[PDB]
């Protein structure tokens, strides 16, 4: 109604909408640290 609105609104994402309105895919990496054994680490640089 007049005071009732749908909580979800849709993007336009037109091909010519221009930078700032064009779709952008975002991947957010969050590093979780706890008092548990470490499982994820950077590569070990193997040399001869």
């Amino acid at each position: 109604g007049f005071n009732c609105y749908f909580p979800l609104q849709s993007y336009g994402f037109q091909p010519t909408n221009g930078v700032g309105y064009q779709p952008y895919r975002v991947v957010v990496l969050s590093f979780e640290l706890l008092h548990a054994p470490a499982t994820v680490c950077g590569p070990k640089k193997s040399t001869n």
Binding site: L34, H35, A36, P37, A38, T39
Partner: protein, 48 residues
Amino acid sequence: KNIDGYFKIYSKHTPINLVRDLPQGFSALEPLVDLPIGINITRFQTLL
């Protein structure tokens, strides 16, 4: 066992010809699984 938040599994498949009880002798058990589960364990159950 669970030490330092690390779950360890050891095994040994020596052939046993005494069906009554475990024969007298010595056999060390090699490690197989070293997964850091991180889930505290206080109970145990077996599948059949």
